[PDB]
Amino acid sequence: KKDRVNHCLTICENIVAQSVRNSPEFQKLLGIAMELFLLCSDDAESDVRMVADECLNKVIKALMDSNLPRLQLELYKEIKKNGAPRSLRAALWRFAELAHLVRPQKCRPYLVNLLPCLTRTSKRPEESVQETLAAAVPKIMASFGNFANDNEIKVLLKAFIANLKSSSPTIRRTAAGSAVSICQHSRRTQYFYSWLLNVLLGLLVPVEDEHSTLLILGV
Amino acid sequence: XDIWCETNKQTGILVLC
């Protein structure tokens, strides 16, 4: 049991103070440390996960002045690989908590990289990944959504409107919240509210059809 | 981190004139 707690907790105790930062050794050591903790965030024992959670948090707090863009590249890579659900969640909400710290010269390429991730994470059936994405979208879009174009936004809105028919109340809540927020943090808010109303009325407008209770509840 | 770190060249000095 405890051996991997001693390993990650001593890796956390070390890397906050090792060597000089921005060196060619420290970039590698920090990559391996994030890879190790995000893996330990999905290990099969309770106190191991709680210690991995406080190891990621202490290391981000310690290195924000100096390695913020590398921390966000490591968290993004764990989102990109779409793995086990606690491993994905442990990266996703942390990336969303850091999203305001990216410099304006770095928002556009993260917008382009995250839409393939958000549109894969909305296709995950597990409700805890969805409750995490429901928190992440209103923070991600408030940090990147003015850097999107209209076709990129319409791809996100389509990916969440597809979920309004779901049997899970949580999936419908995640979609209903995400779609309105994606519009709200666009460069074109009044147009996107108009487009989203045309979709939402359009989904119930042929009022004689056998619409499902699930789709009505989402809309 | 910063643009002196990224450009790999030094910060200046504080002095009166």
GROMACS .gro file of C-alpha atoms in nm:
model
  236
    1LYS     CA    1   0.000   0.000   0.000
    2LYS     CA    2   0.204   0.302   0.135
    3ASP     CA    3   0.520   0.264  -0.087
    4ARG     CA    4   0.369   0.469  -0.377
    5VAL     CA    5   0.247   0.736  -0.129
    6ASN     CA    6   0.608   0.773  -0.004
    7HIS     CA    7   0.725   0.786  -0.371
    8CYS     CA    8   0.481   1.058  -0.495
    9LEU     CA    9   0.495   1.260  -0.167
   10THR     CA   10   0.880   1.264  -0.179
   11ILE     CA   11   0.871   1.352  -0.554
   12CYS     CA   12   0.638   1.643  -0.455
   13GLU     CA   13   0.872   1.742  -0.165
   14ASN     CA   14   1.173   1.739  -0.406
   15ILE     CA   15   1.064   1.912  -0.732
   16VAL     CA   16   0.937   2.233  -0.561
   17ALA     CA   17   1.305   2.308  -0.471
   18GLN     CA   18   1.535   2.100  -0.706
   19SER     CA   19   1.816   2.270  -0.905
   20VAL     CA   20   1.749   2.599  -1.096
   21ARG     CA   21   1.420   2.631  -1.292
   22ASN     CA   22   1.407   2.681  -1.676
   23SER     CA   23   1.707   2.434  -1.703
   24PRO     CA   24   1.705   2.147  -1.963
   25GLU     CA   25   1.693   1.885  -1.680
   26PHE     CA   26   1.401   2.046  -1.489
   27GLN     CA   27   1.161   2.047  -1.788
   28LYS     CA   28   1.205   1.664  -1.813
   29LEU     CA   29   1.177   1.604  -1.435
   30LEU     CA   30   0.855   1.816  -1.423
   31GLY     CA   31   0.705   1.624  -1.720
   32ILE     CA   32   0.772   1.287  -1.546
   33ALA     CA   33   0.630   1.427  -1.216
   34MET     CA   34   0.298   1.534  -1.380
   35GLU     CA   35   0.279   1.201  -1.573
   36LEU     CA   36   0.331   1.015  -1.240
   37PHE     CA   37   0.074   1.216  -1.036
   38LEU     CA   38  -0.202   1.213  -1.302
   39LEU     CA   39  -0.159   0.831  -1.321
   40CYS     CA   40  -0.170   0.805  -0.936
   41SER     CA   41  -0.497   1.011  -0.952
   42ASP     CA   42  -0.665   0.688  -1.086
   43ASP     CA   43  -0.490   0.422  -0.867
   44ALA     CA   44  -0.701   0.157  -0.686
   45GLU     CA   45  -0.660   0.290  -0.323
   46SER     CA   46  -0.825   0.592  -0.149
   47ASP     CA   47  -0.543   0.767   0.046
   48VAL     CA   48  -0.311   0.722  -0.261
   49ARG     CA   49  -0.557   0.929  -0.473
   50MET     CA   50  -0.598   1.195  -0.199
   51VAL     CA   51  -0.215   1.230  -0.178
   52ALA     CA   52  -0.182   1.250  -0.561
   53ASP     CA   53  -0.450   1.527  -0.555
   54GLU     CA   54  -0.258   1.732  -0.293
   55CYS     CA   55   0.075   1.663  -0.478
   56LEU     CA   56  -0.054   1.811  -0.809
   57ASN     CA   57  -0.204   2.109  -0.621
   58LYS     CA   58   0.116   2.189  -0.416
   59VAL     CA   59   0.339   2.157  -0.727
   60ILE     CA   60   0.113   2.386  -0.940
   61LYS     CA   61   0.107   2.642  -0.651
   62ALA     CA   62   0.491   2.621  -0.622
   63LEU     CA   63   0.569   2.642  -0.998
   64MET     CA   64   0.304   2.897  -1.127
   65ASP     CA   65   0.562   3.186  -1.117
   66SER     CA   66   0.801   2.996  -1.349
   67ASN     CA   67   0.653   2.690  -1.535
   68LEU     CA   68   0.278   2.768  -1.587
   69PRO     CA   69   0.293   2.700  -1.969
   70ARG     CA   70   0.460   2.356  -1.910
   71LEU     CA   71   0.207   2.257  -1.638
   72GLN     CA   72  -0.077   2.343  -1.882
   73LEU     CA   73   0.091   2.145  -2.168
   74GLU     CA   74   0.116   1.837  -1.937
   75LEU     CA   75  -0.250   1.870  -1.822
   76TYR     CA   76  -0.363   1.921  -2.186
   77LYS     CA   77  -0.175   1.602  -2.297
   78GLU     CA   78  -0.361   1.399  -2.029
   79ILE     CA   79  -0.693   1.545  -2.158
   80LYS     CA   80  -0.579   1.471  -2.522
   81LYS     CA   81  -0.531   1.092  -2.459
   82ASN     CA   82  -0.894   1.050  -2.327
   83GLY     CA   83  -0.808   0.771  -2.075
   84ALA     CA   84  -0.957   0.644  -1.746
   85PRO     CA   85  -1.222   0.881  -1.599
   86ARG     CA   86  -1.051   0.997  -1.273
   87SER     CA   87  -0.723   1.049  -1.468
   88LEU     CA   88  -0.914   1.264  -1.725
   89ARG     CA   89  -1.109   1.460  -1.454
   90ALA     CA   90  -0.790   1.528  -1.252
   91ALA     CA   91  -0.640   1.702  -1.560
   92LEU     CA   92  -0.961   1.867  -1.693
   93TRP     CA   93  -1.067   2.075  -1.390
   94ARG     CA   94  -0.701   2.175  -1.320
   95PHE     CA   95  -0.654   2.295  -1.681
   96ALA     CA   96  -0.981   2.493  -1.648
   97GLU     CA   97  -0.863   2.649  -1.313
   98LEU     CA   98  -0.540   2.766  -1.486
   99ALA     CA   99  -0.699   2.880  -1.818
  100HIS     CA  100  -0.701   3.258  -1.732
  101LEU     CA  101  -0.318   3.252  -1.682
  102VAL     CA  102  -0.235   3.195  -2.057
  103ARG     CA  103  -0.088   3.508  -2.227
  104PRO     CA  104  -0.298   3.642  -2.528
  105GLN     CA  105  -0.031   3.516  -2.778
  106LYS     CA  106  -0.113   3.155  -2.660
  107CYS     CA  107  -0.501   3.150  -2.651
  108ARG     CA  108  -0.561   3.079  -3.028
  109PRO     CA  109  -0.357   2.751  -3.049
  110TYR     CA  110  -0.520   2.623  -2.725
  111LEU     CA  111  -0.868   2.703  -2.870
  112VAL     CA  112  -0.778   2.495  -3.184
  113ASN     CA  113  -0.633   2.210  -2.968
  114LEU     CA  114  -0.923   2.197  -2.712
  115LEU     CA  115  -1.223   2.168  -2.951
  116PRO     CA  116  -1.120   1.809  -3.055
  117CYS     CA  117  -1.101   1.739  -2.674
  118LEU     CA  118  -1.429   1.901  -2.558
  119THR     CA  119  -1.615   1.731  -2.850
  120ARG     CA  120  -1.467   1.391  -2.741
  121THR     CA  121  -1.537   1.451  -2.369
  122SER     CA  122  -1.908   1.530  -2.435
  123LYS     CA  123  -1.928   1.174  -2.592
  124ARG     CA  124  -1.819   1.008  -2.258
  125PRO     CA  125  -2.119   0.827  -2.087
  126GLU     CA  126  -1.996   0.852  -1.721
  127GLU     CA  127  -2.172   1.124  -1.515
  128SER     CA  128  -1.865   1.233  -1.308
  129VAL     CA  129  -1.668   1.321  -1.628
  130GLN     CA  130  -1.976   1.520  -1.738
  131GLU     CA  131  -2.012   1.709  -1.402
  132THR     CA  132  -1.640   1.800  -1.447
  133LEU     CA  133  -1.687   1.916  -1.810
  134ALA     CA  134  -1.991   2.125  -1.693
  135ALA     CA  135  -1.753   2.315  -1.460
  136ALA     CA  136  -1.466   2.331  -1.714
  137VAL     CA  137  -1.657   2.473  -2.021
  138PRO     CA  138  -1.768   2.809  -1.860
  139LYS     CA  139  -1.405   2.864  -1.743
  140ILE     CA  140  -1.234   2.748  -2.067
  141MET     CA  141  -1.466   2.954  -2.293
  142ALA     CA  142  -1.426   3.272  -2.080
  143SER     CA  143  -1.045   3.234  -2.147
  144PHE     CA  144  -1.043   3.132  -2.520
  145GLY     CA  145  -1.391   3.194  -2.676
  146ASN     CA  146  -1.322   3.540  -2.832
  147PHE     CA  147  -1.030   3.363  -3.015
  148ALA     CA  148  -1.274   3.117  -3.186
  149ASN     CA  149  -1.435   3.156  -3.533
  150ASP     CA  150  -1.806   3.095  -3.611
  151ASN     CA  151  -1.755   2.743  -3.757
  152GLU     CA  152  -1.545   2.636  -3.452
  153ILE     CA  153  -1.825   2.763  -3.220
  154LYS     CA  154  -2.096   2.587  -3.431
  155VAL     CA  155  -1.896   2.259  -3.403
  156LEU     CA  156  -1.899   2.295  -3.018
  157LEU     CA  157  -2.270   2.384  -3.005
  158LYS     CA  158  -2.358   2.082  -3.231
  159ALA     CA  159  -2.152   1.850  -3.003
  160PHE     CA  160  -2.358   1.960  -2.695
  161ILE     CA  161  -2.704   1.988  -2.866
  162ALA     CA  162  -2.658   1.617  -2.962
  163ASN     CA  163  -2.675   1.537  -2.584
  164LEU     CA  164  -3.016   1.704  -2.508
  165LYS     CA  165  -3.188   1.365  -2.592
  166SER     CA  166  -2.988   1.174  -2.323
  167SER     CA  167  -3.151   0.959  -2.048
  168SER     CA  168  -2.908   1.094  -1.781
  169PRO     CA  169  -3.030   1.421  -1.614
  170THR     CA  170  -2.658   1.510  -1.559
  171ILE     CA  171  -2.574   1.477  -1.931
  172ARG     CA  172  -2.870   1.705  -2.022
  173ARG     CA  173  -2.758   1.955  -1.750
  174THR     CA  174  -2.400   1.951  -1.884
  175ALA     CA  175  -2.524   2.012  -2.241
  176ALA     CA  176  -2.783   2.279  -2.147
  177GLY     CA  177  -2.522   2.474  -1.944
  178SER     CA  178  -2.236   2.430  -2.195
  179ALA     CA  179  -2.433   2.545  -2.502
  180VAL     CA  180  -2.549   2.875  -2.339
  181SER     CA  181  -2.198   2.943  -2.199
  182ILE     CA  182  -2.024   2.878  -2.537
  183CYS     CA  183  -2.253   3.146  -2.684
  184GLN     CA  184  -2.199   3.383  -2.386
  185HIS     CA  185  -1.815   3.384  -2.425
  186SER     CA  186  -1.816   3.413  -2.807
  187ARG     CA  187  -1.720   3.733  -3.000
  188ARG     CA  188  -2.076   3.733  -3.150
  189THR     CA  189  -2.304   3.677  -2.847
  190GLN     CA  190  -2.633   3.822  -2.982
  191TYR     CA  191  -2.600   3.631  -3.314
  192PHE     CA  192  -2.514   3.307  -3.129
  193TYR     CA  193  -2.811   3.345  -2.891
  194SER     CA  194  -3.026   3.388  -3.206
  195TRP     CA  195  -2.872   3.077  -3.370
  196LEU     CA  196  -2.914   2.869  -3.051
  197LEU     CA  197  -3.284   2.981  -3.027
  198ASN     CA  198  -3.336   2.873  -3.393
  199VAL     CA  199  -3.190   2.527  -3.308
  200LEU     CA  200  -3.388   2.494  -2.980
  201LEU     CA  201  -3.722   2.600  -3.133
  202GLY     CA  202  -3.638   2.387  -3.443
  203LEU     CA  203  -3.602   2.074  -3.220
  204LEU     CA  204  -3.971   2.114  -3.099
  205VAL     CA  205  -4.129   2.331  -3.384
  206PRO     CA  206  -4.296   2.032  -3.566
  207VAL     CA  207  -4.516   2.008  -3.253
  208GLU     CA  208  -4.729   1.714  -3.383
  209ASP     CA  209  -4.428   1.471  -3.384
  210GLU     CA  210  -4.350   1.204  -3.119
  211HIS     CA  211  -4.086   1.414  -2.933
  212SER     CA  212  -3.930   1.228  -2.636
  213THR     CA  213  -3.966   1.347  -2.274
  214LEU     CA  214  -3.582   1.339  -2.259
  215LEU     CA  215  -3.540   1.586  -2.551
  216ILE     CA  216  -3.816   1.812  -2.409
  217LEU     CA  217  -3.640   1.818  -2.068
  218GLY     CA  218  -3.302   1.906  -2.229
  219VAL     CA  219  -3.452   2.180  -2.454
  220UNK     CA  220   0.914   3.230  -1.737
  221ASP     CA  221   0.934   3.607  -1.828
  222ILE     CA  222   1.057   3.782  -2.147
  223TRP     CA  223   1.418   3.823  -2.013
  224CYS     CA  224   1.426   3.439  -1.941
  225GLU     CA  225   1.267   3.370  -2.291
  226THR     CA  226   1.503   3.618  -2.475
  227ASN     CA  227   1.796   3.480  -2.258
  228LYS     CA  228   1.933   3.836  -2.184
  229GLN     CA  229   1.971   4.037  -1.865
  230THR     CA  230   1.754   4.289  -1.676
  231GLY     CA  231   1.900   4.641  -1.614
  232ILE     CA  232   1.988   4.845  -1.299
  233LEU     CA  233   1.809   5.110  -1.084
  234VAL     CA  234   1.995   5.448  -1.066
  235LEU     CA  235   1.919   5.825  -1.041
  236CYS     CA  236   2.021   6.084  -1.308
   0.00000   0.00000   0.00000
